[PDB]
Every structure is written in structure tokens, then in C-alpha cells.
Amino acid sequence: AAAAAFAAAGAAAAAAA
Amino acid sequence: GDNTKWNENQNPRMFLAMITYITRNQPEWFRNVLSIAPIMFSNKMARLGKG
Amino acid sequence: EMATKADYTLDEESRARIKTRLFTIRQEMASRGLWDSFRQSERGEETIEER
RNA sequence: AAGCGAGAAGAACCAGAAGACCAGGC
């Protein structure tokens, strides 16, 4: 179903705490 | 060009000045840790060798 | 004492010995008067700056 | 697209008056 063709960068985020 | 007598002329007191400037506003302990080496080198001694 | 699913996996006498030892240390510490002191435990006094 | 040394959590952690009287606003 929902899929990412090509994901660059490290991803995630430190804002969530 | 190369620099003639580069190693012989790079005084360690200038390295201390560069470190102190670079470590401006840093915690005093960090300044100490970075500045100790130039201090010791400025007071270094050279062994002669075998003889 | 109390455990998961009410299973202690020990003979009654062994658990009795453990509970008696706990009670004895409790009474000795109370004799020392710090029972209320043991009732206090702070989160953390972590302020060790790197010097 | 980037890409030049390693991590994870022992122990255990609230308070009443009530009654009378007086002054006072509405």
C-alpha cells in the first residue's frame, strides 16, 4: 500500500520529547 | 613554496594564544584542557640522544 | 509477602526466616531511630560539574 | 542524496468547632 520509493536523509526528529 | 624552518619558528606561546582565543566563552575547565599542551611545550626540553 | 499468581516457590520456613530477618533489621534500625529517615529518598542531587 | 571508532538503567518512591453577641452591605 502506502510506500516510499526512495527516502533520503536520516529521518526522525528530536522535537518529540 | 614551503616555509623555511617552519617547525623551528612555530612558537608554542602563539599556539597558546590561538587556543585561548578559540576557547573564548567556553567552560574554564575546557580552556584548561586545551591550553595545557601549549604551556608544557613552551617549557619543553629536548633530549640530545645516544651521544 | 506476596508474589505473582500467589506463588512463592519456597518452603514456609524459608519465607518465615526471610520475613523475620526483615523485621529484625527493621527493629534494629528503629532502635537507631532513623526509620523515618529511611522513609525519605530524593530523586537525584546530580550537580557534579566537570572541574 | 549523504556516508570515515563505542552505550541503557541496581535498589525503591486532613482536617470540622459550635454557640452567642456586635458592626455592616444588600
Automatic annotation (TrEMBL), chain B:
Domain of life where this protein originates: Viruses
Binding of Mg(2+) 1, residues: G1, D2
Residues annotated to bind Mg(2+) 2: D2, N3
PTM annotation: Phosphorylated by host PRKCA.
Subcellular location(s) per record: Host nucleus; Host cytoplasm
Binding positions (Mg(2+) 3): D2
Binding site for Mg(2+) 4: D2
Reported function: RNA-dependent RNA polymerase which is responsible for replication and transcription of virus RNA segments. The transcription of viral mRNAs occurs by a unique mechanism called cap-snatching. 5' methylated caps of cellular mRNAs are cleaved after 10-13 nucleotides by PA. In turn, these short capped RNAs are used as primers by PB1 for transcription of viral mRNAs. During virus replication, PB1 initiates RNA synthesis and copy vRNA into complementary RNA (cRNA) which in turn serves as a template for the production of more vRNAs. RNA-dependent RNA polymerase which is responsible for replication and transcription of virus RNA segments. The transcription of viral mRNAs occurs by a unique mechanism called cap-snatching. 5' methylated caps of cellular mRNAs are cleaved after 10-13 nucleotides by PA. In turn, these short capped RNAs are used as primers by PB1 for transcription of viral mRNAs. During virus replication, PB1 initiates RNA synthesis and copies vRNA into complementary RNA (cRNA) which in turn serves as a template for the production of more vRNAs.
Record-stated family: Belongs to the influenza viruses polymerase PB1 family.
Subunit structure: Influenza RNA polymerase is composed of three subunits: PB1, PB2 and PA. Interacts (via N-terminus) with PA (via C-terminus). Interacts (via C-terminus) with PB2 (via N-terminus); this interaction is essential for transcription initiation.
Protein's recorded name: RNA-directed RNA polymerase catalytic subunit
Species of origin: Influenza A virus
Automatic annotation (TrEMBL), chain C:
Domain of life from the UniProt record: Viruses
Maturation and modification: Phosphorylated on serines and threonines by host kinases, including human casein kinase II.
Subcellular location: Host cytoplasm; Host nucleus
Chain ranges passing through the membrane: none
Oligomer and partners: Influenza RNA polymerase is composed of three subunits: PB1, PB2 and PA. Interacts (via C-terminus) with PB1 (via N-terminus).
Family as reported in the entry's similarity comment: Belongs to the influenza viruses PA family.
Function per UniProt: Plays an essential role in viral RNA transcription and replication by forming the heterotrimeric polymerase complex together with PB1 and PB2 subunits. The complex transcribes viral mRNAs by using a unique mechanism called cap-snatching. It consists in the hijacking and cleavage of host capped pre-mRNAs. These short capped RNAs are then used as primers for viral mRNAs. The PB2 subunit is responsible for the binding of the 5' cap of cellular pre-mRNAs which are subsequently cleaved after 10-13 nucleotides by the PA subunit that carries the endonuclease activity.
Protein name: Polymerase acidic protein
Residues of the full protein shown: 154 to 204 of 716
